[PDB]
């Protein structure tokens, strides 16, 4: 009964990934983490390591601690940049350091034989975000789609160089055209259920392409189907 | 970065606990597992070990194999009975063995210093269930609220003897669901989002009462809040 682990590593978008009630409307929404645990049930444990407001610099400090303690991680997402790409302020991390920080994470994961997946920033509803975060905007701490695209492009390049999959959420979020993308966000930065569903489906696509043995449809469903269990339970594990 | 683990051990109702889309309407529902991971984020890992169709006898075989591996489990639910209480057939486990099996699980958990929580069966919408499971019903394999109640009562007794909390879902489903209780189930046995929400709230209540240090409100949220992190990150792990 040792399960392989799938690590989700990142910021608030990873920390918030299991909440079906992101708004106080009572109503339930799709949650990436919930879907992952469900589809990987009796297949792989989902290990959530998301830290709201964190950057690639701070995340780099914590990653070795995670990898030292946890056993049998076989695959992991890295999703940072929604904070790093802020134009100024304490969460800003310049592009060369950002890329090097992510590269170090990929290298460290590879050193544990962990299969990395890089996730790029999604879109920002700037009109909405800047209303709610007016105090930050007054200080000049902008989150723009232009800068998020710069960071996404650099992550695509890094992913290619390190030969790992990249999930381009900024493009995926644009899939229906028009103004449809605005529904993929709750507060203009964090993801709604609809946003998490696109994230999930694109994530699973790169898993099938790069790491098919760890796609839910190819993994062994652990232990006997109940209909096949002997009365005494002697065959459950073999 | 050592996280403690909260183990969820049981049958299909544990296996299915993270699915927000249990039915083909495409409409998301509350999921017990999702709420647990969310509220315990940066506090405790949720370790899911549910096995569809399993009984207390078969689960007793699995349990020592789980506990010998997994490090740092501090608390665990045990939720079996929805299959064991079947009136006949391959899933039926008689009450004396059922109680002894659950007792053995509790005593093994305690030897690992794991805090057990016993969950009782919820309601069965027999009218609906038997329409789907006609072939099983024809073999005489009934799941009845009367028999579920006998198993629930026996679990309450065992829980009291072993000084562990008991969650009486059958009663909680009646009190919260009222005349609408059937909507707490999907196929008449498995739980809907509404059923899982009752399960959740009752579970957290007994955790606060019996095991307060492991209720989310009392647990340390790990690592500095981002607003309190120094530029270089030197204080991220300071309070750990």
From Swiss-Prot, chain A:
Residues the record annotates as the site (Transition state stabilizer) are 53, 83
Gene Ontology MF term list: hydrolase activity, acting on ester bonds
Task: Provide the leader sequence positions.
Answer: none
- Tell me the enzyme class: hydrolase
Q: Describe the protein's quaternary organization and the partners it interacts with.
A: Homodimer.
One Pfam entry name: Lipase_GDSL
Q: Top-down, what is the taxonomic lineage of the species of origin?
A: Eukaryota, Fungi, Dikarya, Ascomycota, Saccharomycotina
Query: Catalytic activity, per the record?
Result: 3-methylbutyl acetate + H2O = 3-methylbutanol + acetate + H(+)
What Enzyme Commission number(s) does the record list for this chain?
3.1.1.112
Q: What's the name of its gene?
A: IAH1
Q: Which organism is it from?
A: Saccharomyces cerevisiae (strain ATCC 204508 / S288c) (Baker's yeast)
Keywords in UniProt for this one? Hydrolase, Lipid degradation, Lipid metabolism
Q: State the pH dependence.
A: Optimum pH is 7.5.
The protein's name in its UniProt record? Isoamyl acetate-hydrolyzing esterase
Which branch of life, at top level? Eukaryota
